[PDB]
Amino acid sequence: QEFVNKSLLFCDRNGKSFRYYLHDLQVDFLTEKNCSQLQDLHKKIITQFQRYHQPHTLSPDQEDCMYWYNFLAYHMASAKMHKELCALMFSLDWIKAKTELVGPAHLIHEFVEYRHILDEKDCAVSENFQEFLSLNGHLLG
Amino acid sequence: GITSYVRTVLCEGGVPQRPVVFVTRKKLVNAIQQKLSKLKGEPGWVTIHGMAGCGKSVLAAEAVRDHSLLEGCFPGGVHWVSVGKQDKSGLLMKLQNLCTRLDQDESFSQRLPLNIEEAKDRLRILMLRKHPRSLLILDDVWDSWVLKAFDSQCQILLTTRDKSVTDSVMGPKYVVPVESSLGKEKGLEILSLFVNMKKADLPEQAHSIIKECKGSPLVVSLIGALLRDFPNRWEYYLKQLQNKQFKRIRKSSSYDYEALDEAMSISVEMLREDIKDYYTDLSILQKDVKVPTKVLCILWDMETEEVEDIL
Amino acid sequence: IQQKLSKLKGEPGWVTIHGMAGCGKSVLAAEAVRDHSLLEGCFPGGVHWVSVGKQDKSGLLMKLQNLCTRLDQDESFSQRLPLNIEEAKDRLRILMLRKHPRSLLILDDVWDSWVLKAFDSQCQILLTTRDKSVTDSVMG
Numbered sequence: 108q109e110f111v112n113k114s115l116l117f118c119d120r121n122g123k124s125f126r127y128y129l130h131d132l133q134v135d136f137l138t139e140k141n142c143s144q145l146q147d148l149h150k151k152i153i154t155q156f157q158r159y160h161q162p163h164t165l166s167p168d169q170e171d172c173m174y175w176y177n178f179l180a181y182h183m184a185s186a187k188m189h190k191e192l193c194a195l196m197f198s199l200d201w202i203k204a205k206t207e208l209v210g211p212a213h214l215i216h217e218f219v220e221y222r223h224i225l226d227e228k229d230c231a232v233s234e235n236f237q238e239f240l241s242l243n244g245h246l247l248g
Numbered sequence: 249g250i251t252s253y254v255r256t257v258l259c260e261g262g263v264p265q266r267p268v269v270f271v272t273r274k275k276l277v278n279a280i281q282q283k284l285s286k287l288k289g290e291p292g293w294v295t296i297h298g299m300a301g302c303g304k305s306v307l308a309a310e311a312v313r314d315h316s317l318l319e320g321c322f323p324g325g326v327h328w329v330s331v332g333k334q335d336k337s338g339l340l341m342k343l344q345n346l347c348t349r350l351d352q353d354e355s356f357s358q359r360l361p362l363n364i365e366e367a368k369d370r371l372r373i374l375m376l377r378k379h380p381r382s383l384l385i386l387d388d389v390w391d392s393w394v395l396k397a398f399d400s401q402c403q404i405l406l407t408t409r410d411k412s413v414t415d416s417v418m419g420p421k422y423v424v425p426v427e428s429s430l431g432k433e434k435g436l437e438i439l440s441l442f443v444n445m446k447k448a449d450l451p452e453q454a455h456s457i458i459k460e461c462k463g464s465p466l467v468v469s470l471i472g473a474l475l476r477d478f479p480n481r482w483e484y485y486l487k488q489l490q491n492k493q494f495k496r497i498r499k500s501s502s503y504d505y506e507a508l509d510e511a512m513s514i515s516v517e518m519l520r521e522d523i524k525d526y527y528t529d530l531s532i533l534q535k536d537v538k539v540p541t542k543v544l545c546i547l548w549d550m551e552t553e554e555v556e557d558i559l
Numbered sequence: 560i561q562q563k564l565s566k567l568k569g570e571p572g573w574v575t576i577h578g579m580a581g582c583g584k585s586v587l588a589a590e591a592v593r594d595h596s597l598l599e600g601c602f603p604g605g606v607h608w609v610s611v612g613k614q615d616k617s618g619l620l621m622k623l624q625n626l627c628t629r630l631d632q633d634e635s636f637s638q639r640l641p642l643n644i645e646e647a648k649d650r651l652r653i654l655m656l657r658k659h660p661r662s663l664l665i666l667d668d669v670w671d672s673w674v675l676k677a678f679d680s681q682c683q684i685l686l687t688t689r690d691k692s693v694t695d696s697v698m699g
């Protein structure tokens with residue numbers, strides 16, 4: 108609320124809720140200003156999250172329920188922790204939750220975009236996942 | 249009959265005006281007006297008490313809405329001048345400022361008095377010849393050193409921490425006990441103006457928290473601004489404040505200070521080590537009980553007469 | 560904006576426009592207020608845009624000494640300047656009361672609430688700042 112009061116943050120008041128956002132340029136500024144602290148932040152919140160709720164435990168009843176499915180892979184990828192990204196996404200539990208809370212299109216998009224992010228063996232596996240995901244999307248939703 | 253002159257001047261204010269959201273303290277407005285007339289054109293000291301942000305000017309604003317009351321007392325106008333806590337050099341700088349205030353058009357020399365004795369003389373001459381029959385109001389009087397230069401048995405209105413200040417000065421004393429408070433519906437009127445809801449449109453929790461706080465306007469104002477932004481959950485700030493309210497934890501506020509200690513420390517620190525501890529030692533008593541004097545002898549290790557005087 | 564400015568109805572209020580240097584903050588106001596009759600009856604004595612910027616205490620004092628001069632363009636009063644903030648408050652009040660009543664002083668680039676402390680007097684004030692939320696720290 109203070110950030111908003113200082114023009115540092117924009118607030119879409121969704122009735123009783125407050126969905127906060129930045130404009131495009133407002134994000135671009137810090138994107139350049141911040142360095143390696145960002146990867147540390149990425150790695151930090153991964154451990155911290157797990158110290159509290161597991162990403163698979165993470166039920167749709169939460170507020171941040173879809174948050175972590177929309178962004179955790181992004182965090183690991185940004186962090187360049189391909190070993191953690193592999194461990195996260197190569198999982199039928201992770202897929203199950205993400206597709207029941209968020210949906211399979213974003214997922215597929217990631218398995219594609221992350222082909223240049225992952226390691227050689229990992230890419231070969233991820234390609235199995237790229238074909239795997241074609242199986243579903245029938246029953247999903 | 250409020251003259252048209254006042255009807256226009258109130259827009260600027262010679263004195264501070266009433267709030268945007270208020271309840272007229274009907275119990276005090278009429279009685280204060282009736283007590284002000286007891287001067288009958290004779291000298292006296294009228295003192296209003298309270299701290300910054302607790303409605304000290306708010307009281308006066310509604311109480312003195314009657315023009316004819318003071319129409320014949322101060323034809324030359326009423327001026328509200330902030331004084332505050334000043335030391336000797338601050339009183340001197342304030343006296344140099346007061347000289348300038350009486351010559352707004354610079355008709356006399358731009359030079360300032362050099363000492364207190366000279367300032368006394370210059371102010372007297374200007375109030376005698378150019379500004380006779382007018383009221384100078386001293387806002388926030390804290391030190392008797394300042395009052396030493398004003399104790400001259402004249403019609404003086406001032407604001408301070410305690411109405412008892414009238415005892416240190418000479419002349420007929422008039423004070424306000426402020427025996428009035430706002431109730432439920434009055435607090436609901438305050439709310440209605442803040443959120444523009446009818447009191448009937450307000451949730452049950454808004455009525456419940458009034459039953460808990462008994463409708464105090466200082467609490468209603470804060471909570472309204474808090475729940476303006478925060479989802480309307482009275483429970484949040486209610487149970488929170490029961491833990492150690494926002495008088496304990498300073499928050500953003502329109503009030504000059506969010507801690508009581510800020511203003512209070514002026515009167516507490518201006519004391520002596522033994523009775524400064526005694527002041528703080530009073531908190532061991534389970535409120536809210538009216539206790540006779542004897543009970544504090546053991547606590548202070550003081551003799552009955554010693555306890556009585558300190559109290 | 561024209562329709563919202565008329566909501567003052569001759570009563571006090573705080574109008575705040577927000578943005579940063581070079582992002583069209585003055586550009587917005589320039590087109591929005593092209594209607595004269597809107598403010599014709601609000602400020603007959605004129606509108607003055609005065610740059611304030613980020614000032615510390617001594618900067619506010621120097622700015623107050625400058626403001627005193629601004630109200631006496633023809634040097635009809637003493638060339639001497641106020642010595643402190645309390646005096647400056649008084650001098651400005653007298654000149655705005657008697658010589659420049661019914662006019663608008665616009666404070667460009669407000670950054671610090673220390674400055675606003677000397678202006679929060681429930682008057683018709685237009686100012687520019689980083690965030691429109693500034694109106695919450697003042698009354699009216």
Ligand SMILES: Nc1ncnc2c1ncn2[C@@H]1O[C@H](COP(=O)(O)OP(=O)(O)OP(=O)(O)O)[C@@H](O)[C@H]1O
Nearest residue numbers: 267269270271299300301302303304305306465469
């Ligand atoms: N009768 C009342 N009805 C509604 N609100 C009240 C009443 N009395 C006090 N208040 C509230 O208390 C606040 C106190 O106002 P203010 O800040 O003017 O107090 P103060 O003691 O006069 O301080 P200062 O004199 O420096 O302004 C008001 O803004 C209002 O929120």
Ligand SMILES: Nc1ncnc2c1ncn2[C@@H]1O[C@H](COP(=O)(O)OP(=O)(O)OP(=O)(O)O)[C@@H](O)[C@H]1O
Nearest residue numbers: 577578579580581582583584585586587590667687
């Ligand atoms: N509606 C508009 N149409 C066209 N150009 C615009 C518009 N709004 C902003 N601009 C552009 O943004 C620039 C901002 O102007 P300017 O430098 O006056 O902004 P500022 O925020 O008012 O800064 P300052 O107030 O110190 O001048 C303009 O010169 C123009 O290039």
